[PDB]
Amino acid sequence: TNIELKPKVEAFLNEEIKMFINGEFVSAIGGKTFETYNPATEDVLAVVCEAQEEDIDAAVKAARSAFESGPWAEMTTAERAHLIYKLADLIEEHREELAQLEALDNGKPYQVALDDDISATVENYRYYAGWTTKIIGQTIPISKDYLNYTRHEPVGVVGQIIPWNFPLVMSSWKMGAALATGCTIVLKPAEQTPLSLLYAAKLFKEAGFPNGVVNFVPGFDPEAGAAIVNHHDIDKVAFTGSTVTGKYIMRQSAEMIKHVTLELGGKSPNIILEDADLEEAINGAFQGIMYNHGQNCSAGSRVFVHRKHYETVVDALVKMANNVKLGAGMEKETEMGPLVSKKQQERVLNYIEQGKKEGATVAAGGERALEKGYFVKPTVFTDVTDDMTIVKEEIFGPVVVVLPFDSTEEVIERANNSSYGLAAGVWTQNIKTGHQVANKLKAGTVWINDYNLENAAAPFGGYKQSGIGRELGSYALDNYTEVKSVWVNIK
Amino acid sequence: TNIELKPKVEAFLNEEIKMFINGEFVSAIGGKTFETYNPATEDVLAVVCEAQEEDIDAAVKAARSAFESGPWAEMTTAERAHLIYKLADLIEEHREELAQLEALDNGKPYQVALDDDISATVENYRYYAGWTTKIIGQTIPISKDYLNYTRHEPVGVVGQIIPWNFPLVMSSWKMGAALATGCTIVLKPAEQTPLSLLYAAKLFKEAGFPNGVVNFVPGFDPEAGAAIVNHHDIDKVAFTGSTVTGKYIMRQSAEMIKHVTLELGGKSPNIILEDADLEEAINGAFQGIMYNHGQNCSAGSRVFVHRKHYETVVDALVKMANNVKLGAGMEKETEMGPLVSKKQQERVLNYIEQGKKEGATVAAGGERALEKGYFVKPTVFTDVTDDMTIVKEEIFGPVVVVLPFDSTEEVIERANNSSYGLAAGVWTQNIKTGHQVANKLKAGTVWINDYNLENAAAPFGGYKQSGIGRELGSYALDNYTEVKSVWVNIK
Amino acid sequence: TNIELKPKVEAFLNEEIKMFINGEFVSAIGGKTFETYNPATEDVLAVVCEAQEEDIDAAVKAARSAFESGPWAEMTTAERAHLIYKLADLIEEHREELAQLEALDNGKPYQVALDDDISATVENYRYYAGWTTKIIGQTIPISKDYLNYTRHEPVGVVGQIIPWNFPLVMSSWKMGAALATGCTIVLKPAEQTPLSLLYAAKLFKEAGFPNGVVNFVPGFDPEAGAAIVNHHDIDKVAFTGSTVTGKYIMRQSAEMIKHVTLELGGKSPNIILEDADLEEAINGAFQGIMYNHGQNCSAGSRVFVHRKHYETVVDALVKMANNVKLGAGMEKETEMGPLVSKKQQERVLNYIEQGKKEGATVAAGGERALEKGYFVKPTVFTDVTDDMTIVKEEIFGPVVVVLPFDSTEEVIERANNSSYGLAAGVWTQNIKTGHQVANKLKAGTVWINDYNLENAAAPFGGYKQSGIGRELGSYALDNYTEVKSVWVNIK
Amino acid sequence: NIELKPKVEAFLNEEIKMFINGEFVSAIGGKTFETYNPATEDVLAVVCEAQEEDIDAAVKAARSAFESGPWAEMTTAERAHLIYKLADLIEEHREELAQLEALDNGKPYQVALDDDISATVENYRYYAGWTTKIIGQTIPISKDYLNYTRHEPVGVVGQIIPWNFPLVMSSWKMGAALATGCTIVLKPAEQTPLSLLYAAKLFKEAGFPNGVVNFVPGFDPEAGAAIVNHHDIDKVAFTGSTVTGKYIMRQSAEMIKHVTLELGGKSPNIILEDADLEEAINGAFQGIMYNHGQNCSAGSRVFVHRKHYETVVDALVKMANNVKLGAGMEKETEMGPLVSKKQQERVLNYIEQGKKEGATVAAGGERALEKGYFVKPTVFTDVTDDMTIVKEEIFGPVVVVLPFDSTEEVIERANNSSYGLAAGVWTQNIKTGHQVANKLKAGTVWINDYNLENAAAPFGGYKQSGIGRELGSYALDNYTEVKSVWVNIK
Ligand code: NA
Ligand code: NA
Ligand code: NA
Ligand code: NA
Ligand code: NA
Ligand code: NA
Ligand code: NA
Ligand code: NA
């Protein structure tokens, strides 16, 4: 039993989905299109204009112009704040449309898209609306003969690329901080998930964003992706997605000495210590990995359990795994949707095979589910060791690896022995051991007796090969900023 | 008349010069040595142990181990501040020694190595010892169910590579900020100028630095340099030198998703507007380019002159160029010493040639000077245009191009039309013009009615191809930190 | 002639004006009422419920209980930020009603209350709405054995008392910062101008403020004001008004060791140096004193003019003083309305007399104007000396004193020679002088080539007897915060 | 028996001079007063006595040093250097300063050396580092203006400090004020002027230009009032009794002088049911007995969960009777005398008042030894919230121990006080520690510890325990005026 389609999403899917360049909704200069799918049913869900290299130079020129002259270059910070703020309101106004688009286009459940994704995107904008007037430089006291101050100047035209797992919320992670600073934007959504953002384009127009401040260019990584990465007149690039493609972007960026920001993958450890509150910790371990179908860079894909509790938690995770209600995002019953694509499904089925072939046991799941659509069963793997492919590599599906350990110093050593370092979970009732452990984990975010919490105000990012830089909080601003130290001789 | 050699610099130079690894003075593991020259006389100044890849490896291991355990991992921020402070005192103490080594090894005049270099380095250390206790994170008010806090953790083992133009002071730009955050160090000084730093090693030992906190690995870019940029166990990398080599570093760093900071070359404009205080602006224009033999990334290598004053400044720059007293850095009368090497003298005479062949006029200088040593005459070029190699590329010598202009909007445009953006100078008595112009120039440092000022407390660095990141100031600390977001569930 | 009453101000004025306690519009417990006047006609404007000691108690209990429990105490910073922003929207929707109310009740011209007062009140609440999410504390690295962190906790219930010269805007200076930290508020408007704020009360309720977060108690200083400064359960106090009463408030606050923030009077200098753009400076000097009929603690009430220009600026100010069009605030052609009260007209006419008695000359104005109304003619005094009453005391009317000077060193001395230090203006085209002079003036804000500019983002407050603390900008938050330093032993 | 350092003997062999305008001077009118050794009750030294006219010479010297000459023209680096040189000298003279503290204040030598001197050295080192990092803001409002703020030194500051940590308290005051570029008129307590007056040599030697610091010993109604009421002092800072604080703020009002106050307390130290009991017992005991209880943030109220009450009472009584009482300059002393006759009497009198309202003295409750201002460490039992000794700052080694049955009950009883200086929480639970910390109305909260202070971390009172914070970056704001500059560039 189904969620009735919102009239505005009907009217929107009923037509070719246009790109948004220089204030206008447009086709690709050359007329190419591509299809996005409903991953639950595998039908074409919409036909979308495809940005080629040439649509990207157009988007760069519009952003370059909006950055140098016209209202965006001349507004006070109070006016810019006010724009970002009205955007937040219109989005909030269209919350149901956007959540349906996310459910339909990404696959995730409607009600979680609404409660989590949409509300976070709104609040992110609202939080960044707030920074615009508060991005301060320094005055530095050095000597009587000089006034010394710094300016935090927006770097300019920003190229941003985002993946398909939290489409709209990620557009906001990118654009809220970049906009707060006065930059202009050329942003490409993922091929699997363009609809969320191109719908939101209506909302930027209604809010009154001047022409060119924001430019949305959907398409493929080798064409629209590359053309952004390689553009001579883009001042800075931010990317989230595969550790692999990150390497590429940094390499390409070398050429222009362009600042890079990278939010990449993870194999984040979720540590249940001997004195954890097991009630809570089991739920955390399960939510840790299963939330968004495991399609989450910071998923707790390695669940470490003290030996005392090992069997209890395996038994619980197994029971909860076989209980998940799989089905369509737009069906009210659904607890976990399908994976985003056929390719994504095949890759995680592959990993499960490698798991088996390496000698690990599947204690639940391990295979596809349902009649059509890209589903996989929640999977729990057991009898696992540290050097196994499934324990080392990011799978990006509802697949968890559970790992006994015997001492605190041991679990920190094994949690840290990864070139990933996005996130980590620690479950202990003890005040001393919670901080001591959090301190010693090499990870950008540590939750003590929780997991998977994000907020506009708290920075998020990787150590080691999980990333360069932070997004969210005050920290994300520095990425979009170029520091100028002015010395005024006054002797 | 010669500056008399210091007893301690004589003893140091009488022996093979050792590397500094894990608290110990040592030879290269394979016993290789290389020679470093006195650029005034072309003699061998010293023989120096040469670090190979395996030496770099021993430096990383010693750094990794001083980072994870032992006194440096365990001491309070106050004990760390004190070490850095005592270091600065010890340097102040051996100031004449270090100044002679800079005169001898690098070439610059003794007195200016004493008053500028040694003194700035001492001051940089003292400024940074002050940060150690004040490196602060946030507590973030989000919700009554969580304590949210960030930690600024040292990134770990830091690979650092510096050039030959301000050898000691440049070692402090790297080490001050890094050590202040708790980081550990493997640092390579330039093949041309290893002595300052290797002498200074005595002082880190004497100050009581724990073993392996700091490691000094003299040698070549293809060997020691590459081994640092490629090492898998180095967490972060910092480099200053050619935009050329910067690109290579950034590209290799991509493999490991390693954070990079780059301080690179410039073609910095020094702009003399109509209402300049002309007597002042003339000296700033001459000093802007001639200071340190023009071997200065932020040299005012393009002097822009409002047309009314163009002839006047040229004549002055010519008369001044021809009066500089060239000689050995250890002779008392010397105002400008030799260029650092035969290679550098060739690169610069070459640029001058290209200058002549593209139609520019050599108004003063234009050739080598004296019987021996790597000397080039201070050089003034007129009848230049924006598209000339000599006006577009970094020469890295005492060579200046003078350009007339007719309007402020014109000179703004022409100053900015460059891939570089390290520094700029503007001279004007007017309150509005000063800041308007400063705001409009794309440059990491803008001096209004001054030039070439640096201080520990003020960040320095390039826009565009002049770099990524900042050194000095609070800002430099961010380069050596990883931000950890901790969520403490208190529901 | 006349601007017609808005329907909603008509409805509001046909009725007894109710107070606002604990989310309810109420009468005084004892049912007392008082009158407020149109200063243009002397007519009764409205009758208003009069808060007594018992009404303050009821207000404080409601604020205390809204601080300790219920939605305001539970809600996230995001929700709290959102309430403050919806408030600002409503104030903007009612912009015309609020401006009429201000013109009618305080006396200033409608157009300026609308363009200045209301828009600045909107912008102040928009600005602080952004802060609630960014009131950050510190994590302080001291020793591995501890976690150190500080929380900025809201002080609690705060008592705020404001004057009559900018009634609504001044309510936002106090409440914007206080509410952003999560404090609750008991606020008393001036007896001359309660209307704005009590109309604004609808808007707090309609925006969804929880019961008791905000409580408005109109009345008199000996009853309602006194009950506020003396109340044992009010945690913190903030006042703006005469230096005299500030003294009283600070004294009284000593008995409870209560943080005080005071915003008081001035005798601010506006200084025209030899190389000023004389045209902009003349206008700047005239607006500086004449804006808001001189009822402005930071009015440029001593105009210092370099000798070469004295006569020119005296002529122009006399002519300008003679030309201002005096009229009711609700007549469309009026440039300056009347002073707020009979008492105020009397005090300033008295100052004028005194000025005359001490041997100063009245170059313009110096007497009442029109048939009815608390009007006073814009007034210019010449032949003044530094120890005269009129040049030392705050007059709070459209009365200015013009003094010649001969050197920069001289005018700095004379400007600073005052117990006041609220503000200062300097007019010069020279980049050195503008900064030199502004560095040496003892004033909380200094305008170089302008005057009377305020913005939510820039701090305002006085040196010496002009006050304690700052309002506006990030700085104002500190006044409403109590710093907690937490030590977590993790040994 | 610890022997006098030769430079300490030299210092005490002479009348003790004030320090004004870089000069060691006698009082203009020639008055002197005595300071005593509170272990032996003999005069320890005869000190020049500052009168109103001396404070007035000090303010002039200070005003002049702020407004012109080297202290007003130095780079922040030069100024930092002077502060660091001071810290070194203090460290060089650590044994001398420690002995003076032990002799003048009464505290044990080893503690004076290990705590007081090292803390004061650290404070100056810490603040020397700030002088270069006192930054203001550049504020992006509009393109027509450059907006920036300067954090300027407020000017000549007036500082008054108590006798319980004489040298460290001179640093909490001077460190942050000097870092901002202010100049100083400082009065040490009449009971303990010596450390400061010795340290004055080190300021001169470090190269402080004349009149940057000026030290004026004497009495609160003469030198003290002169400072608070002086027309040319820009700002005032005081630490001492809640009562003198009211007077200070009261007087300060007349000139709209910024006040910073650090005052008394009755701080709770709360042992919950899941504390580590061995650790919480030691902390409860140190928390009150450290520095003989003459410590505004002494945990003078120990709340114990009912389950553990009798256990901790037993241990506190045992440890209270174990402390070794004696002279500060004697090798084995763990706790010395109170600072004066008047203090010893105030405290015995609080003891009487507790007995007579019905509390039981489970240990101590009377003077100790033949001569000197000693009182036995004292533990109070059968106490209720209502009693004098439980509401009022006693300021001696006297603890009151109270049972509680619930976390809500103890939080409310801890908070039910006009004080809020500090608090301690003992519990092994991660949630409970931060919830409780969050709820206590107190400027610093220690979780599983007590009495920790460090130059980096703010210290200060809620409610009547003070206004403002000292230490940390926070302290700088008290010594600063914020100037907001607008530059029209339209
Ligand atoms: Na799709
Ligand atoms: Na990384
Ligand atoms: Na050399
Ligand atoms: Na750059
Ligand atoms: Na009225
Ligand atoms: Na004041
Ligand atoms: Na004494
Ligand atoms: Na207080």
PDB file of N, CA, C and O in Angstrom, chain B residues 86-120:
ATOM      1  N   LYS B  86      63.151  27.523  24.801  1.00  0.00           N
ATOM      2  CA  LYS B  86      64.584  27.413  25.152  1.00  0.00           C
ATOM      3  C   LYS B  86      65.382  27.314  23.845  1.00  0.00           C
ATOM      4  O   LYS B  86      66.488  27.878  23.712  1.00  0.00           O
ATOM      5  N   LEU B  87      64.743  26.684  22.847  1.00  0.00           N
ATOM      6  CA  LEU B  87      65.308  26.580  21.515  1.00  0.00           C
ATOM      7  C   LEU B  87      65.617  27.949  20.941  1.00  0.00           C
ATOM      8  O   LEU B  87      66.726  28.201  20.486  1.00  0.00           O
ATOM      9  N   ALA B  88      64.637  28.838  20.981  1.00  0.00           N
ATOM     10  CA  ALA B  88      64.803  30.209  20.517  1.00  0.00           C
ATOM     11  C   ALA B  88      65.945  30.939  21.255  1.00  0.00           C
ATOM     12  O   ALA B  88      66.736  31.655  20.627  1.00  0.00           O
ATOM     13  N   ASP B  89      66.046  30.740  22.562  1.00  0.00           N
ATOM     14  CA  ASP B  89      67.135  31.364  23.344  1.00  0.00           C
ATOM     15  C   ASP B  89      68.523  30.895  22.875  1.00  0.00           C
ATOM     16  O   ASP B  89      69.457  31.668  22.807  1.00  0.00           O
ATOM     17  N   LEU B  90      68.604  29.611  22.535  1.00  0.00           N
ATOM     18  CA  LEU B  90      69.851  28.975  22.181  1.00  0.00           C
ATOM     19  C   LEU B  90      70.312  29.460  20.828  1.00  0.00           C
ATOM     20  O   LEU B  90      71.482  29.768  20.650  1.00  0.00           O
ATOM     21  N   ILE B  91      69.336  29.613  19.932  1.00  0.00           N
ATOM     22  CA  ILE B  91      69.504  30.272  18.632  1.00  0.00           C
ATOM     23  C   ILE B  91      69.916  31.722  18.758  1.00  0.00           C
ATOM     24  O   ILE B  91      70.836  32.128  18.079  1.00  0.00           O
ATOM     25  N   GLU B  92      69.232  32.511  19.585  1.00  0.00           N
ATOM     26  CA  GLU B  92      69.641  33.887  19.835  1.00  0.00           C
ATOM     27  C   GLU B  92      71.110  33.857  20.289  1.00  0.00           C
ATOM     28  O   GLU B  92      71.926  34.680  19.873  1.00  0.00           O
ATOM     29  N   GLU B  93      71.439  32.868  21.113  1.00  0.00           N
ATOM     30  CA  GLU B  93      72.763  32.772  21.680  1.00  0.00           C
ATOM     31  C   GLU B  93      73.821  32.529  20.607  1.00  0.00           C
ATOM     32  O   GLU B  93      74.884  33.149  20.650  1.00  0.00           O
ATOM     33  N   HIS B  94      73.549  31.641  19.655  1.00  0.00           N
ATOM     34  CA  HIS B  94      74.538  31.325  18.621  1.00  0.00           C
ATOM     35  C   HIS B  94      74.277  32.168  17.366  1.00  0.00           C
ATOM     36  O   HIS B  94      74.590  31.753  16.265  1.00  0.00           O
ATOM     37  N   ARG B  95      73.708  33.365  17.540  1.00  0.00           N
ATOM     38  CA  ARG B  95      73.247  34.185  16.416  1.00  0.00           C
ATOM     39  C   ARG B  95      74.354  34.529  15.424  1.00  0.00           C
ATOM     40  O   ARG B  95      74.118  34.553  14.236  1.00  0.00           O
ATOM     41  N   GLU B  96      75.556  34.788  15.906  1.00  0.00           N
ATOM     42  CA  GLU B  96      76.659  35.182  15.036  1.00  0.00           C
ATOM     43  C   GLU B  96      77.159  33.993  14.241  1.00  0.00           C
ATOM     44  O   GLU B  96      77.464  34.098  13.033  1.00  0.00           O
ATOM     45  N   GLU B  97      77.224  32.855  14.916  1.00  0.00           N
ATOM     46  CA  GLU B  97      77.557  31.621  14.269  1.00  0.00           C
ATOM     47  C   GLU B  97      76.603  31.363  13.092  1.00  0.00           C
ATOM     48  O   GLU B  97      77.057  31.114  11.941  1.00  0.00           O
ATOM     49  N   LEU B  98      75.291  31.434  13.384  1.00  0.00           N
ATOM     50  CA  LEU B  98      74.271  31.072  12.396  1.00  0.00           C
ATOM     51  C   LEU B  98      74.256  32.088  11.262  1.00  0.00           C
ATOM     52  O   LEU B  98      74.154  31.685  10.073  1.00  0.00           O
ATOM     53  N   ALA B  99      74.392  33.384  11.618  1.00  0.00           N
ATOM     54  CA  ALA B  99      74.508  34.415  10.597  1.00  0.00           C
ATOM     55  C   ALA B  99      75.712  34.206   9.644  1.00  0.00           C
ATOM     56  O   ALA B  99      75.541  34.354   8.411  1.00  0.00           O
ATOM     57  N   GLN B 100      76.893  33.837  10.180  1.00  0.00           N
ATOM     58  CA  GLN B 100      78.064  33.529   9.324  1.00  0.00           C
ATOM     59  C   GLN B 100      77.780  32.354   8.375  1.00  0.00           C
ATOM     60  O   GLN B 100      78.139  32.403   7.175  1.00  0.00           O
ATOM     61  N   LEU B 101      77.174  31.294   8.910  1.00  0.00           N
ATOM     62  CA  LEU B 101      76.870  30.110   8.089  1.00  0.00           C
ATOM     63  C   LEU B 101      75.919  30.483   6.945  1.00  0.00           C
ATOM     64  O   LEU B 101      76.065  29.987   5.829  1.00  0.00           O
ATOM     65  N   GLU B 102      74.993  31.403   7.202  1.00  0.00           N
ATOM     66  CA  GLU B 102      74.068  31.866   6.165  1.00  0.00           C
ATOM     67  C   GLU B 102      74.808  32.695   5.099  1.00  0.00           C
ATOM     68  O   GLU B 102      74.586  32.500   3.884  1.00  0.00           O
ATOM     69  N   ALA B 103      75.700  33.588   5.550  1.00  0.00           N
ATOM     70  CA  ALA B 103      76.595  34.381   4.668  1.00  0.00           C
ATOM     71  C   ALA B 103      77.477  33.515   3.789  1.00  0.00           C
ATOM     72  O   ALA B 103      77.600  33.718   2.599  1.00  0.00           O
ATOM     73  N   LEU B 104      78.087  32.548   4.418  1.00  0.00           N
ATOM     74  CA  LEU B 104      78.976  31.625   3.776  1.00  0.00           C
ATOM     75  C   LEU B 104      78.192  30.627   2.886  1.00  0.00           C
ATOM     76  O   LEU B 104      78.500  30.452   1.713  1.00  0.00           O
ATOM     77  N   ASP B 105      77.202  29.950   3.454  1.00  0.00           N
ATOM     78  CA  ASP B 105      76.538  28.866   2.764  1.00  0.00           C
ATOM     79  C   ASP B 105      75.554  29.411   1.695  1.00  0.00           C
ATOM     80  O   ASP B 105      75.552  28.957   0.567  1.00  0.00           O
ATOM     81  N   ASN B 106      74.736  30.399   2.052  1.00  0.00           N
ATOM     82  CA  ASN B 106      73.750  30.899   1.123  1.00  0.00           C
ATOM     83  C   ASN B 106      74.250  32.017   0.189  1.00  0.00           C
ATOM     84  O   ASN B 106      73.778  32.125  -0.969  1.00  0.00           O
ATOM     85  N   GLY B 107      75.126  32.887   0.745  1.00  0.00           N
ATOM     86  CA  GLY B 107      75.677  34.027   0.022  1.00  0.00           C
ATOM     87  C   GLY B 107      75.310  35.418   0.503  1.00  0.00           C
ATOM     88  O   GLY B 107      75.980  36.408   0.165  1.00  0.00           O
ATOM     89  N   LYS B 108      74.222  35.541   1.256  1.00  0.00           N
ATOM     90  CA  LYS B 108      73.719  36.879   1.521  1.00  0.00           C
ATOM     91  C   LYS B 108      74.689  37.604   2.464  1.00  0.00           C
ATOM     92  O   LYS B 108      75.480  36.952   3.154  1.00  0.00           O
ATOM     93  N   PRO B 109      74.610  38.949   2.533  1.00  0.00           N
ATOM     94  CA  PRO B 109      75.520  39.690   3.444  1.00  0.00           C
ATOM     95  C   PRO B 109      75.353  39.330   4.942  1.00  0.00           C
ATOM     96  O   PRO B 109      74.212  39.239   5.444  1.00  0.00           O
ATOM     97  N   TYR B 110      76.472  39.135   5.654  1.00  0.00           N
ATOM     98  CA  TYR B 110      76.467  38.767   7.087  1.00  0.00           C
ATOM     99  C   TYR B 110      75.537  39.622   7.952  1.00  0.00           C
ATOM    100  O   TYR B 110      74.759  39.098   8.706  1.00  0.00           O
ATOM    101  N   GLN B 111      75.624  40.946   7.823  1.00  0.00           N
ATOM    102  CA  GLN B 111      74.875  41.823   8.699  1.00  0.00           C
ATOM    103  C   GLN B 111      73.354  41.614   8.522  1.00  0.00           C
ATOM    104  O   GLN B 111      72.599  41.553   9.509  1.00  0.00           O
ATOM    105  N   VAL B 112      72.904  41.501   7.275  1.00  0.00           N
ATOM    106  CA  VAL B 112      71.483  41.231   7.049  1.00  0.00           C
ATOM    107  C   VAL B 112      71.050  39.844   7.414  1.00  0.00           C
ATOM    108  O   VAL B 112      69.936  39.670   7.803  1.00  0.00           O
ATOM    109  N   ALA B 113      71.938  38.870   7.385  1.00  0.00           N
ATOM    110  CA  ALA B 113      71.569  37.546   7.908  1.00  0.00           C
ATOM    111  C   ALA B 113      71.394  37.620   9.423  1.00  0.00           C
ATOM    112  O   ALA B 113      70.548  36.896   9.988  1.00  0.00           O
ATOM    113  N   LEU B 114      72.157  38.500  10.069  1.00  0.00           N
ATOM    114  CA  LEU B 114      72.097  38.695  11.521  1.00  0.00           C
ATOM    115  C   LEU B 114      70.832  39.406  11.980  1.00  0.00           C
ATOM    116  O   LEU B 114      70.101  38.874  12.807  1.00  0.00           O
ATOM    117  N   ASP B 115      70.582  40.590  11.428  1.00  0.00           N
ATOM    118  CA  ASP B 115      69.439  41.429  11.743  1.00  0.00           C
ATOM    119  C   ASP B 115      68.061  40.930  11.254  1.00  0.00           C
ATOM    120  O   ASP B 115      67.060  41.217  11.864  1.00  0.00           O
ATOM    121  N   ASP B 116      67.996  40.234  10.123  1.00  0.00           N
ATOM    122  CA  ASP B 116      66.733  39.797   9.557  1.00  0.00           C
ATOM    123  C   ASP B 116      66.529  38.319   9.826  1.00  0.00           C
ATOM    124  O   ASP B 116      65.616  37.932  10.567  1.00  0.00           O
ATOM    125  N   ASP B 117      67.397  37.492   9.263  1.00  0.00           N
ATOM    126  CA  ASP B 117      67.141  36.063   9.283  1.00  0.00           C
ATOM    127  C   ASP B 117      67.156  35.483  10.683  1.00  0.00           C
ATOM    128  O   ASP B 117      66.136  34.969  11.124  1.00  0.00           O
ATOM    129  N   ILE B 118      68.289  35.590  11.383  1.00  0.00           N
ATOM    130  CA  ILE B 118      68.440  34.960  12.696  1.00  0.00           C
ATOM    131  C   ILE B 118      67.390  35.526  13.630  1.00  0.00           C
ATOM    132  O   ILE B 118      66.666  34.811  14.322  1.00  0.00           O
ATOM    133  N   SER B 119      67.269  36.829  13.585  1.00  0.00           N
ATOM    134  CA  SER B 119      66.319  37.492  14.418  1.00  0.00           C
ATOM    135  C   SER B 119      64.865  37.061  14.097  1.00  0.00           C
ATOM    136  O   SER B 119      64.049  36.919  15.010  1.00  0.00           O
ATOM    137  N   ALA B 120      64.530  36.834  12.823  1.00  0.00           N
ATOM    138  CA  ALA B 120      63.124  36.482  12.512  1.00  0.00           C
ATOM    139  C   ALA B 120      62.933  35.046  12.965  1.00  0.00           C
ATOM    140  O   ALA B 120      61.862  34.682  13.496  1.00  0.00           O
TER     141      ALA B 120
END
